[PDB]
Amino acid sequence: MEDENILRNAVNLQVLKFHYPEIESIIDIASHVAVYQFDVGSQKWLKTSIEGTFFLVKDQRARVGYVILNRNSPENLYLFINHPSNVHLVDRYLIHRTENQHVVGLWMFDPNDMSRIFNIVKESLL
Amino acid sequence: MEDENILRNAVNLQVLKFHYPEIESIIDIASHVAVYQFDVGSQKWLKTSIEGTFFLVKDQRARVGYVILNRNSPENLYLFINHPSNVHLVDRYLIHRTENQHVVGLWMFDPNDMSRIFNIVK
C-alpha cells in the first residue's frame, strides 16, 4: 500500500526536523550504514561509534547533506556535500572529504543502497 | 677568545649541510628546545619525542627555517617559516603554523633565547 510510505516519510521528516530545523526534505534513505574515519596521524582507517539509519536530505539553503541517526549513542552525524570531486565510490564503500577536510568512509549493509545513493548524489550536485 | 666561535659555527654548518645540503648559513642557535604538536582529533596538545639543539638557518632559496637536531632519536625536525604572521609568541611558548598547516609548539629552555629568536625571525 502506498499510504504507508507517505506516513513513514512524514514521521521521518518530523524527527530529522526535530534534530535539525534547517532540513527541508528527505531525498533518500539507506537502512544500515557504518561510519569510518581516516586518521591522519595513524595513516589508517578507524571505525567510529556511529551506526544506524542513513538519511540523504536537502535543507532550506538547497544544500545536499546526510544525517545518520546513531543507534549506539545520541551523537548523530550531519555532514554536507558541496563538490562532486569530494565523494568517490571505491569498491563497496563511499569515501567523502568533508567541509573540514576530514575523510569519512560509509559502508552500506545493503550493496544496492550504495549504488543508488551514490548515483542520486551525483545527480544532486549537478 | 673569538676563534672558538668561528670554529663552533663552522662545524655546526658542516653537520647541518650533511643532513640537509640546501642549507647555506646559520642565523642563530638556541640551546635546548622541546617540540609539541597539536592534534586535530584530540583537540589537545601532545609532547613529541624531538628534543635538542635548535638551529635557525637560511637555505639556498633565501628561505628562513629551523632544524632541531634530536638528542633522543635520529629523526630530526626541519621546518620552514614562510610568513611572519604564521608565527606567534606566547608568554613563554612559540607557536608556528607550518607549510602543511600543522600547529607546532617550541619551548626554549632559555627564555632570552625565546625572545631573541622570535625577534630575529621577524
Binding site: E51, V90 | E75, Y78
Partner: peptide, 22 residues
C-alpha cells in the same frame, strides 16, 4: 557484522595530509 577498517581501500593521495618530516 561490519567489515574491519583494515579492508577499506586507500583514499585518494591528495586527500591525506602528510603528518611530519620523514
Amino acid at each position: 557484522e561490519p567489515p574491519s577498517p583494515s579492508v577499506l581501500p586507500k583514499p585518494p593521495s591528495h586527500w591525506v595530509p602528510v603528518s611530519f618530516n620523514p
